[PDB]
From Swiss-Prot:
It comes from the Eukaryota. The chain holds residues 1 to 327 of 1207 of the full protein. The coatomer is a cytosolic protein complex that binds to dilysine motifs and reversibly associates with Golgi non-clathrin-coated vesicles, which further mediate biosynthetic protein transport from the ER, via the Golgi up to the trans Golgi network. Coatomer complex is required for budding from Golgi membranes, and is essential for the retrograde Golgi-to-ER transport of dilysine-tagged proteins. It is found in: Cytoplasm; Golgi apparatus membrane. Oligomeric complex that consists of at least the alpha, beta, beta', gamma, delta, epsilon and zeta subunits. This is Putative coatomer subunit alpha. WD repeats lie at residues 9-50, 51-90, 93-134, 135-174, 199-238, 243-282, 285-316.
Length: 316
């Protein structure tokens, strides 16, 4: 397989990247605390955003609203409007580095996870934290909403991947209620762990759902990428991709081909077969560790963050 590079930015270490759903943009979140907005069709720098102190690992666009969210080592989950170019507010509550932040595709929610061993769900309209998911016993390195089901998957340095049922939280946060102002409490099961996936012998750095199949991918400091399957009642390990020679920082499913992608501190991006879990192709940079990979929500277009910036590319 061949990599067709479409855009590269050279910079100090990049940690996160996010594709805009409809515009030819990527947000890049940097170790230096800044966030860049690039047009990858023209190679132009559209804006730069400075609202964090220290590295910013979390970064995502809302799918339809003119918003993006960022999460930093300063513990804040920041919500911005990219049209007015301004920081709207900070969501505070995490007590250690924020590792990932994303928006839900339908509900007015933001998902964040943190080294404080928690996953938080926020309602970005009310600006409240509506759930704190506890149960991991070390840093939560990744969390993700399922694309069609009321599930979250999370990965932790406790060596586990957890699947959480948030159907209760959805029912409760959506239910309309009338409120008598004078009759409120004077300072008065939503998310339940469904599966705990055990198998990695070291910390887990990343987890991903497949967009249409009941599969989970996870990757970690054991240099392995694992494939898991789930039903309504069970979840189990299917197989392992073996080949990386250093920590695997990120992994994802190719949304339109039977392929798995992973990215590693071994300075490679690897492609594997979804059915055989054998190697298909290895792409290497000489001096740059990879920290993150993502795929466009519709196009076969990928982006990777590494020690010297970001790249946007197609595959053969």
């Amino acid at each position: 397989m061949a990599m067709l590079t479409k855009f590269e930015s050279r910079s100090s270490r990049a940690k996160g990247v996010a594709f805009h759903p409809t515009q030819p943009w990527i947000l890049t979140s940097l170790h230096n605390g800044r966030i860049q907005l690039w047009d990858y069709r023209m190679g132009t720098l559209l804006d730069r955003f400075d609202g964090h102190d220290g590295p910013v690992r979390g970064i995502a666009f809302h799918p339809t609203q003119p918003i993006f969210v960022s999460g930093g080592d300063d513990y804040k989950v920041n919500v911005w409007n990219y049209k007015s170019r301004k920081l709207l507010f900070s969501l505070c509550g995490h007590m250690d580095y924020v590792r990932v932040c994303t928006f839900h595709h339908e509900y007015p929610w933001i998902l964040s996870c943190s080294d404080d061993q928690t996953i938080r769900i926020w309602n970005w309209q009310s600006r409240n934290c509506i759930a704190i998911l506890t149960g991991h016993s070390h840093y939560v390195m990744c969390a993700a909403f399922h694309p069609s089901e009321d599930l979250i998957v999370s990965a932790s340095l406790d060596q586990t991947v957890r699947v959480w049922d948030i159907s209760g939280l959805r029912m409760k946060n959506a239910a309309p209620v009338s409120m008598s102002k004078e009759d409120q409490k004077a300072q008065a099961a939503d998310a339940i762990v469904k599966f705990v996936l055990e198998g990695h012998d070291r910390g887990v750095n990343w987890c991903a759902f497949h967009p249409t199949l009941p599969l989970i991918l996870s990757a970690g400091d054991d240099r392995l990428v694992k494939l898991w399957r789930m039903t309504a009642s069970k979840a189990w390990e299917v197989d392992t991709c073996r080949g990386h020679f250093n920590n695997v920082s990120c992994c994802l499913f190719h949304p339109h081909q039977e392929l798995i992608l992973s990215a590693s501190e071994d300075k490679t991006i690897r492609v594997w077969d979804l059915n055989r879990r054998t190697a298909v192709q290895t792409f290497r940079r000489a001096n740059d560790r990879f920290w993150f990979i993502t795929v466009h929500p519709k196009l076969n277009l990928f982006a990777a963050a590494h020690d010297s910036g970001v790249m946007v590319f197609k595959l053969e």
